[PDB]
């Protein structure tokens, strides 16, 4: 448990933590704001309420 001979290993564990930290921040905001592939439930339920299913007669 000496930090003078394992310096190279610590940098790998440190630099990685920094990269992972940014990815978590970017993913959270971007997925909701970014429009890729499928829509979100909140945006898809505004579309299903414009064409509701009618199991009754009118």
């Amino acid at each position: 448990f000496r930090d003078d001979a394992c310096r190279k290993e610590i940098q790998g564990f440190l630099d990685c933590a920094a990269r992972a930290q940014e990815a978590r921040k970017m993913r959270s905001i971007q997925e909701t704001l970014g429009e890729s592939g499928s829509l979100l439930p909140n945006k898809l339920n505004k579309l299903l309420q414009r064409f509701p299913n009618k199991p009754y007669l009118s």
């Binding site: 064409f51 299913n53 009618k54 199991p55 009754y56 007669l57």
Partner: protein, 100 residues
């Protein structure tokens, strides 16, 4: 000797056209919302085709294009419904500008 309605319907282009599936028709752009183009082609409903990337500028209101119709009215019935669900529009593919 007044023409009846049954004679109009028999000799109408739509009637004689037959099934719209893979039919080449000529449309007229009457409304443009951003890239989307709203096109009438002598039917009950319009079709909404997206502006072609190659020559977007040429597609202004009035431009007459070529379409390949698939449906004249998009309808379907889904689980539990008592009637068909319609989006009030036709399905067609834009094949460019009618170059008279």
């Amino acid at each position: 000797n007044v023409e009846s309605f049954a004679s109009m319907l028999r000799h109408s282009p739509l009637t004689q056209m037959g099934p719209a599936k893979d039919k080449l028709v000529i449309g007229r752009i009457f409304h443009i919302v951003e890239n989307d183009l709203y096109i009438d082609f002598g039917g009950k409903f319009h079709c909404v085709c997206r502006r072609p990337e190659v020559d977007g500028e040429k597609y202004q209101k009035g431009t007459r294009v070529r379409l390949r119709l698939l449906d004249l009215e998009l309808t379907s019935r889904f689980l539990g419904a008592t009637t068909d669900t319609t989006v009030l529009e036709a399905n067609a593919v834009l094949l460019g500008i009618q170059e008279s």
